[PDB]
């Protein structure tokens, strides 16, 4: 694994990937001020450098952050190889559930004595969505279950928090699932448990 | 470069994620008989080999596609560290959006000449997703936008393709993002536009 000068690299012409959250990248930047950037990005030897295979975010994200330079495998492939690599890796990925992101803020505060501030900084977070995904876990069980398949989006999970009766939450939570109402909707119905 | 002899390798059993997905890790074990592993698993000294920071799909596999070694980085990190890396490389991506997905796989048919087939074998998809991928860039340019900003889901999108007058599809598809409707809902609605 080389360092690559990040002034070395440009950026692919043909890459699939046009929009770039702005906020999403600020987020990788600030996970790369506290830990480097974890995974070599893949370049090819472009001219007067190299040009970027796959890693366009982590590129950016670390010129953001005044790194000098980046981690880099330098790959010897085709232009149509290349693409299907930019591809392969965007793609064949597997996100943690809402449950399993709550989880791992948990492990850190409780087994690793780290403050809500310090877990933001060390993974790159809003502070909000550090807060908001540690409240999801005093859910009852059945909830949080619907959190984790995906039958419940974190906004409804989090209006349902507001439910005083835990009987009534759940109740409330299996009937927004089933009917698979909006998240407005399932506002309105919490404030009438009251 | 370094590449770890597939049996020293053993999971952490404080990783944060649990559940594997079957058809997720087929598919990402035929990307790595395509294409190999392309970012190396993140691992750390332990016992009498080395213990996964990140990487255990990689790893799980690496193994069903039967290979003898995957591509490691030896990291001499703390415990907290390694459990802050592994949070850090699951939650700090984006994912490119449907539209972008089928352009990519458009690309490889008509700029460098793949079949539909050899796509699916190089990048590691099932036939379905392609054929469904390539089928939504047929819709106007209003309703791909939709389905590149999450207004519409993929499922709303294969539905609205039945769809014969073009001035009607438009019509619906502004319909059911703005009244949020279900998938289900937008079937029905089809029919009897025929
Ligand atoms: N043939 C492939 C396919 C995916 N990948 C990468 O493998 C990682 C998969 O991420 P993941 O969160 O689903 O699974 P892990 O292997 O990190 O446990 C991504 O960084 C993909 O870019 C790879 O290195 N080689
Ligand atoms: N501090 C960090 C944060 C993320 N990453 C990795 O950077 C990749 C981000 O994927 P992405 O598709 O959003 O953007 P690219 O950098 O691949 O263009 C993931 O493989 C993350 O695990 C890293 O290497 N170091
Ligand atoms: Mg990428
Ligand atoms: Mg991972």
Redesign the interface.
């Known amino acids: 694994?080389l360092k690559l000068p990040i002034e070395s690299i440009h950026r692919d012409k043909?890459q699939?990937?046009?929009?770039?959250?702005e906020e999403?990248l600020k987020?990788?930047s600030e996970?790369i001020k506290?830990?480097g950037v974890?995974?070599?990005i893949?370049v090819r030897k472009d001219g007067d450098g190299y040009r970027i295979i796959?890693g366009a975010?982590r590129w950016r994200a670390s010129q953001a952050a005044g790194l000098k330079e980046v981690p880099a495998?330098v790959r010897d492939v085709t232009?149509?190889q290349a693409?299907?690599?930019?591809?392969?890796?965007?793609?064949?990925?597997?996100?943690?559930?809402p449950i399993?992101?709550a989880?791992?803020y948990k492990?850190?505060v409780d087994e690793?004595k780290?403050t809500q501030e310090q877990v933001s900084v060390?993974?790159?977070?809003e502070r909000s969505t550090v807060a908001n995904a540690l409240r999801l876990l005093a859910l009852p069980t059945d909830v949080k279950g619907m959190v984790a398949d995906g039958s419940l989006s974190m906004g409804h999970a989090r209006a349902l928090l507001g439910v005083p009766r835990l009987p009534e939450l759940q109740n409330l939570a299996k009937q927004v699932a089933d009917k698979?109402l909006?998240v407005r909707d399932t506002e309105r119905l919490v404030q009438q448990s009251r």
Chains 1, 2 share one sequence.
């Open positions: 694994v043909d699939p990937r046009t929009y770039f959250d999403k987020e990788l996970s506290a830990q974890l995974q070599p893949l796959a975010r495998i232009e149509v693409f299907e690599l930019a591809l392969v890796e965007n793609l064949q990925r597997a996100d943690l559930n399993e992101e989880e791992g492990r850190l690793f780290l060390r993974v790159g977070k698979k909006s």
